[PDB]
Amino acid sequence: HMATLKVIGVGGGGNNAVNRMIDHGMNNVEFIAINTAGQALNLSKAESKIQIGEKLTRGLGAGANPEIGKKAAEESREQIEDAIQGADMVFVTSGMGGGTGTGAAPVVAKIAKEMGALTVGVVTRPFSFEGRKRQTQAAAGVEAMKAAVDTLIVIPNDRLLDIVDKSTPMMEAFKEADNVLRQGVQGISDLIAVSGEVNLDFADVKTIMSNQGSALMGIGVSSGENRAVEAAKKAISSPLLETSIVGAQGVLMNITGGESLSLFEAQEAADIVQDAADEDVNMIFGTVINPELQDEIVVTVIATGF
Ligand SMILES: Nc1nc2c(ncn2[C@@H]2O[C@H](COP(=O)(O)OP(=O)(O)O)[C@@H](O)[C@H]2O)c(=O)[nH]1
Ligand SMILES: [K+]
């Protein structure tokens, strides 16, 4: 009776994200690759691959046309549905601005939502250097995604330019963007498998994420003195997110630590999130005592209600 989580990459960036997460190792999660491009799809490492629009595109891409991606997805609805079937939670990841992701990712999410799955989008917006038409297409896709998901995390690719130095490889920067989805999925998966002392379950995840719009999904790990405060600051202060914690009115917050986890520092962590939100936050709070940890503390935050 464990919740089934799947991650679906749509289009090239989404396919890239899936491949990098599989390489990094992700257990108990099923991956699905959806694309118009057959070359990319044949190099995908996902167990489940769906080629959409083969008649439309002959296995090439949609060439940055969103209408092609939308039509390709709608005409493969049943295959997408079969691939999703059994899922309790679906993450759809895609780079907005192109044709396949922009057009197909909202269809995929709507399919998941109408199968009852808790449906979370994690998408990118294009770099400014890609031009205003691409940004405008991406914007339309972001809006379409919001209509189709339960919660949406947007990562403006421009924020990657804030976290590199002059030498950081592009693949390394892309992995920092991948960590938003990967660590969010892993945090939800760990919350679900492990009974905590103050317990949170999938139903608590649905309460914070179902039908909520923009969201924030963060993780923080710290040790030493003031660890709980520092871990909580880390969980809510990502430089890559379009939606910051501010104005968040619902929050799911789980703290994992060793047997040394004090009530005092749990309150400290929670106050850091309440204060940073600058609202009265509806907090769903959990704790998990993992004795294998020694002096390490993990704070997972999901915030919605914007
Ligand atoms: N962060 C990140 N952004 C990507 C990646 N690949 C593509 N992008 C971005 O996603 C947008 C759409 O590209 P792509 O996914 O290849 O288009 P599609 O396959 O035609 O939907 C691009 O304009 C880039 O902004 C990636 O691997 N990581
Ligand atoms: K649990």
Chain breaks in the chain (C to N over 2.5 A) after: none
Q: DSSP assignment of 16-34, as one string?
A: HHHHHHHHT---SEEEEEE
Beta carbon of 15 within 6 Å of any ligand 1 atom: no
Calpha distance 175→183 (Å, rounded): 11
In total, the chain counts a number of residues equal to 306
* 285 beta partners: 253
| Residue recorded with tokens 């945090």 | 187
- Which is the closest atom of ligand 1 to the Cα of 105? 21
For ligand 1, atom 1, name the residue with the nearest CA: 174
Calpha distance 301→251 (Å, rounded): 7
- Helices 66-74 and 77-84: crossing angle, nearest 10°? 70
Contact criterion met (CB below 8 Å) for 272 and 229: yes
- Which is the closest atom of ligand 1 to the Cα of 69? 21
- Which is the closest atom of ligand 1 to the Cα of 101? 21
Give residue 187 CA to ligand 1 midpoint distance, Å: 25
Quote the tokens at residue 75.
Answer: 């005409």
Structure's resolution in angstroms: 1.8
Beta carbon of 257 within 6 Å of any ligand 1 atom: no
Beta carbon of 53 within 6 Å of any ligand 1 atom: no
| Residue recorded with tokens 């780079």 | 95
Contact criterion met (CB below 8 Å) for 164 and 244: no
Calpha distance 85→244 (Å, rounded): 33
Distance of CA 182 to the CA centre of its chain: 7
Annotated binding site for GTP: 12-16, 99-101, 130, 134, 178
Buried b (16+ CB within 10 A) or exposed e, 197-232: eeebebebbebbbeebebbbbbbbbbeeeebbbbbb
109 by Cβ neighbours in 10 Å (0-12 / 13-18 / 19+) ranks as buried
Q: DSSP assignment of the chain, as one string?
A: -PPPEEEEEEHHHHHHHHHHHHHT---SEEEEEEES-HHHHHT---SEEEE--HHHHTTS--TT-HHHHHHHHHTTHHHHHHHHTT-SEEEEEEETTSSHHHHHHHHHHHHHHHTT-EEEEEEEEPPGGG-HHHHHHHHHHHHHHHHH-SEEEEEEGGGGGGT--TT--HHHHHHHHHHHHHHHHHHHHHHHHSPPSB---HHHHHHHHTT-EE-EEEEEEEESTTHHHHHHHHHH--TT-SS-STT--EEEEEEEE-TT--HHHHHHHHHHHHHHHTS--EEEEEEEE-TT-SSEEEEEEEEE--
Sign of CA dihedral 234, 306, 185, 9: negative
Beta carbon of 156 within 6 Å of any ligand 1 atom: no
Query: Greatest CA span in the chain, whole angstroms?
Result: 62
Calpha distance 98→74 (Å, rounded): 17
Contact criterion met (CB below 8 Å) for 105 and 14: yes
Name the residue type at position 61. Answer: G
Calpha distance 47→132 (Å, rounded): 36
Calpha distance 101→138 (Å, rounded): 9
Calpha distance 34→12 (Å, rounded): 9
CATH architecture of the domain with range 5-185: 3-Layer(aba) Sandwich (3.40)
Contact criterion met (CB below 8 Å) for 103 and 21: no
